[PDB]
Amino acid sequence: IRNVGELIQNQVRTGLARMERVVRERMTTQDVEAITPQTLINIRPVVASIKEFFGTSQLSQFMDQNNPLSGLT
Amino acid sequence: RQAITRAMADQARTIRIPVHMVEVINKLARVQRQMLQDLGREPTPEELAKELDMTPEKVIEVQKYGREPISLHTPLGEDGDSEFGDLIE
Amino acid sequence: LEEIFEEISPIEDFSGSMSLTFRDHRFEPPKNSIDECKDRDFTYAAPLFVTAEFTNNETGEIKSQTVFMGDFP
Amino acid sequence: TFKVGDTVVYPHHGAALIEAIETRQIKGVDKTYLVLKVAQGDLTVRVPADNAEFVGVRDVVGQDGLDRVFEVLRAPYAEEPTNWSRRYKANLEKLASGDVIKVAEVVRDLWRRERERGLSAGEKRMLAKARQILVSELALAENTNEDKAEALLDEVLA
């Protein structure tokens, strides 16, 4: 079973892989002695992946709140 | 670079956006991203307007223009026959 | 998250000169309460902070910094 | 050459203060590592003393620095090419050169062309960055810092 932790870890890993792709594109077009850790990295793919998992994904489901048994199930 | 970005401005979007509008809107997008990575929070449109020296209503107008349409044939969920296209009147 | 950050190895360019490393991750208290998020259509999230260093072997230069990685639900 | 408790200026980050001296070894080779940090980017910079001149650090210039910067700040008969592309390619190179004099005529030219025509707002970002790094540099160079350093420029830039 992929629980919630492993699923969120996989989505964050995909976002981080996209971020590494973007930054690897960035370093090859950037000069040394002018790169700041605040600058070269971009967190947009990470938050995009997290919001793509939490919204409109078949695992992240609308919680059924009929009664406590429905919630526990 | 000039021809590639001109073709991207002219033909990529379904609704045509002129090249100067495209360069304005993606400059605003990149400086908004710079603001986000600088202060770690979503800025108010007034701050972005005053730091770019345009009116806030112009900023609202251009980020309303800078939108991508969603296709009519998006599936709704588990059901396959029910499409998004039959829901609109 | 420390596993997903240690898995991202210090990457190198084609010359093997400069690298960045995400050492430690930390969390801040959320800016909104649970009822406040449940009321005004917010996402119950907290900011995620990581310590990142930028190491170049040729210059011997290390840039340790803390960078906002995104609002973590 | 380099001590503890003094201030040295680093490129692309402005002036900074040295915290202490560490003995960090890189690639298994012991080096005289010096550590310093700045309050702008909240980052710590570790540079060994052997390649300090090679990486491009400079000490704080004393009285000689303000007189020459003021003299260039007021130098007339400054000319630039008509095409904006060559000047655009030259300004960031002169900024990355790291010279105080060079960034002085760069910011003077940028300020005068921004006031006479009102070029755009995209270049205003690096204009403000250059203004911030120069006012951080002259904070120790001219012995005037923070608001006082900003105030001194307010009446000598014209």
UniProtKB/TrEMBL annotation, chain D:
Cross-referenced InterPro entries: CarD-like/TRCF_RID, CarD-like/TRCF_RID_sf, CarD-like_C, CarD-like_regulator, CarD_C
What is the official name of this protein in its record? RNA polymerase-binding transcription factor CarD
Q: Where is the CarD-like/TRCF RNAP-interacting domain?
A: 1-111
A Gene Ontology annotation in the biological process aspect, one of them, is: rRNA transcription
Family to which the UniProt record says this protein belongs: Belongs to the CarD family.
Q: Which PANTHER family match?
A: RNA POLYMERASE-BINDING TRANSCRIPTION FACTOR CARD, TRANSCRIPTION FACTOR YDEB-RELATED
* Native species: Streptomyces coelicolor (strain ATCC BAA-471 / A3(2) / M145)
